[PDB]
Amino acid sequence: GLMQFTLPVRLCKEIELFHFDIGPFENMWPGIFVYMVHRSCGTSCFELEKLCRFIMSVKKNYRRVPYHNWKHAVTVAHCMYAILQNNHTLFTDLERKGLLIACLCHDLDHRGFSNSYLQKFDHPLAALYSTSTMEQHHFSQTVSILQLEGHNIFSTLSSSEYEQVLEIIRKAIIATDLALYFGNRKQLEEMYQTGSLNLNNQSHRDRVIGLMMTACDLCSVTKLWPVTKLTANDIYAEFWAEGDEMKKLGIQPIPMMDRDKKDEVPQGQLGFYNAVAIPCYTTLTQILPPTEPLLKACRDNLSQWEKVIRGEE
Ligand SMILES: Cc1c(C(F)F)nc2ccc(C#Cc3nc(-c4ccccc4)cn3C)nn12
Ligand SMILES: [Mg+2]
Ligand SMILES: [Zn+2]
Structure with missing residues (x-):
């Protein structure tokens, strides 16, 4: 009841920053996530015994692939934590509750393959879900784990609150399909620049949370250069x-995807920062000013990839 989670001093301070790296000690990642729920949402948001059991089941349903793994899940949740803590009063109790869970769950049971590869292989998931194939699968795995005995972390919500939170989580998870990001950011750009953007309009909130999700999902381009470079x-x-x-x-x-063309990675990262990352964090900073550090760190990393191209590293 009166059982705070606390982190060592360097983590207690660095975890509040956008560029925090959760570290190579896997056994501390659950405690880091509980710490973030307790300060983001409150010590009363979830029953500790249920949350712990939920975290350990989510962890077991991430696979041992090189990138789309348990460390990515907790990393993407920590970025969301940083956005929520820097924009305290902009979000509902239900949004705080939903979005950290959404982030932890957003790539459940990923196999390290794109939606495109599923479609060309003709994987059964591609016939069950014709668009956002893996993302509809991740939401489906989330609901599964939520329905395991002793795992319902939302048990105290009303019937209609429960339905709202699962709807926030569904939209948040679907929005991590980067194919959907391009149109969502363009619409947010237009709405912001004509002054129609309205955070009381639920379909507008939906889009802003969508863009937050892309920003959290791409947060490896916003780390200190050695983290960014090794994650690549x-x-x-x-x-x-x-x-x-x-x-x-x-x-x-x-x-x-062609390992034969390894040599042109630096130029490919340039494309990706200019076509995807920089626009993402630019539009996000316009809508949510305290997220500017994500844009600044992204720009610093683009500048490091430029340096790699010029033989300066
Ligand atoms: C860093 C990162 C993150 C996460 F860290 F945010 N997510 C992603 C998703 C995509 C990419 C890319 C990329 C990319 N390489 C090439 C290329 C490479 C070699 C030869 C020719 C072309 C083209 N392209 C678009 N980076 N990325
Ligand atoms: Mg994904
Ligand atoms: Zn992801």
Whole structure:
């Protein structure tokens, strides 16, 4: 009841910053997530015994792949924690509750393959869910774990509060489909610049939470350079495995997934920062000013990739 979680001093202070790295000690990641729920949401949001059992089941349903793993789940939740703590009064009790869970769950049972590869392999999930294939699967796994005995962390919510929270989580998880990001950010850009953006309009909140989700999901481009650079190795380890699998089906993968074109990674990261990351954090900073550190760190990393291209590293 009066059982606070506390972190060592360097973590207690650094966890509040956007560029925090959760570290290589897997056994501390659950405690870090509980710490973030307790300060983000309150010590009363969830029954501790249920939350702990929920976390350990979520962890067991992430696979040992190079990037889309348990460490990515907790990393994406910590970015969400930083956004919520820097924008205290902008979010409902239900949103605080839903979004950290959404982030922890957002890639449940990922296999390290894109929606495209599922469609070309003709995976059963591609027939069950024709768009946002993996993302509809992640939400489906979340509901499964929520319905295991002793795992219902939302048990104290009313029938209609429960339905709202599962709807926040569903939209949040669907929005991590980067194919959906491009149109969502363009609409948020237009709405902000014409002054129609209205946080009382629920379909507007939906879009802002969607963009927050893309920003949390891409938060590896916002870390200190050595974290960003080493994470890129995990990201490409999956892309190149998918590339290998495309070649097995008799299909030339795109160059991003072709390990034969390793040499042009620096130029590919440039494209990605300019086409995806920079716009994402730009529009997010416009709508939520205290998120500017994400944009600043993103720009610093683009500048490090430029340096790699010029042979300065
Ligand atoms: C860092 C990161 C994160 C997360 F850290 F945010 N998520 C993502 C998602 C995509 C990418 C890319 C990428 C990319 N490489 C190439 C390329 C590479 C070699 C030869 C030719 C082309 C093209 N392209 C778009 N980076 N990324
Ligand atoms: Mg995903
Ligand atoms: Zn993700």
